[PDB]
């Protein structure tokens with residue numbers, strides 16, 4: 001994908017909830033640092049929902065595209081109020097941007 | 104003297120599936136032009152456009168409203184409180200060419216209903232039969248509310264729209280969608296975290312976040328949050344009033360009731376000033392793109 005347009009998508013459709021850095025801001029959504037192996041959620045006092053905890057799913061490139069295409073369809077009852085990346089070109093542009101900021 | 108009676112004549116040879124083709128045309132362009140207003144979409148602006156055309160109604164003489172759809176004329180097109188709605192107009196302009204049979208009143212109203220359902224909001228039944236009227240019936244400027252007012256101004260303005268306290272607090276929950284623009288209305292900042300997703304966050308971040316009355320770059324005073332949110336005075340006044348607060352706290356702890364109450368209030372809002380016969384069909388409930396496999 002394109003890691004430079006993914007910076008634009010994340011700043012406009014994700015930064016008001018999530019911050020991929022090092023701390024734990026947890027504005028509305030949890031932090032997305034080190035999204036390689038987390039399955040359901042993380043243990044940092046962040047009150048998740050019993051929607052994503054059910055049936056742990058490794059955060060891979062192919063399944064997050066399913067999650068960012070339709071969030072509630074992929075996880076029924078998720079608190080993340082997001083419309084969805086209905087396109088696949090910008091879905092590859094964004095996931096390319098996330099994986100580079102998880103070191 | 105007698106008041107004006109605006110009878111709703113359904114479009115000649117037009118069934119439910121025909122209006123469903125207009126809904127899909129609107130809903131698809133919402134998905135195509137995804138980068139508008141920094142990837143907010145035309146969703147929020149099409150809701151505000153639908154309300155402003157329905158907000159010029161006056162129950163005392165039955166003037167204004169969404170029936171005539173006189174937004175095509177330059178009089179109410181360049182109102183000082185209507186700046187920024189041109190984007191929703193030119194959004195529906197190619198659609199009105201695709202379906203030249205529909206009335207502008209029905210297009211303007213259907214656009215707002217389409218936006219709420221496509222933004223994961225409650226289903227809003229919708230009727231047809233709005234008719235286009237000439238220019239001499241275009242409402243004058245100033246029939247819309249002011250952003251810098253009080254809860255007393257809120258309740259007094261919505262009596263002219265014939266809506267009680269419960270319907271007002273419901274319709275305000277739609278303001279968690281979109282963003283205020285300095286170049287348009289004199290207030291800057293976004294309303295909520297989900298810019299284009301219909302949720303009850305308007306009631307949550309109003310009661311949970313910390314608000315301070317700050318000053319923006321237009322000398323206007325607005326209520327800003329510690330998380331980046333902001334509302335206008337006419338909004339923040341809802342919690343200054345005890346009767347509104349009892350409804351704000353109800354919609355904040357129970358989203359299901361806020362969704363059911365919004366539909367009836369928002370349908371009533373779009374149907375104000377329209378006299379339907381008994382031969383008129385039941386109000387339509389269109390299918391969203393997601394329910395149609397998209």
Ligand code: HEM
Nearest residue numbers: 013014017028029040041048049052078079080082296297
């Ligand atoms: C809030 C307004 C918001 C937006 C716009 C958004 C978009 C993107 N997210 Fe997300 N997210 C939340 C908020 C928002 N997100 C919330 C709340 C959650 C938690 C929901 C829950 O069930 O607890 C949330 C979750 C995620 C996840 C899953 C993380 C996990 O399971 O531990 C991911 C991967 C995620 C990322 C994104 C991206 C990318 C967005 C937009 C480009 N959010």
Ligand code: HEM
Nearest residue numbers: 147151154187248249250274277281282283284287288337
């Ligand atoms: C007294 C009540 C209200 C007042 C004074 C008011 C005023 C305003 C103002 C000043 C803006 C800024 C527009 C811009 O900067 O472009 C705005 C935006 C908006 N309004 Fe209202 N509003 C009220 C109620 C409502 C209601 C009842 C609805 C819907 C049912 C609504 C829908 C919207 C939406 C969706 C936006 C976002 C527009 C955008 O993002 O461009 N508002 N409102």
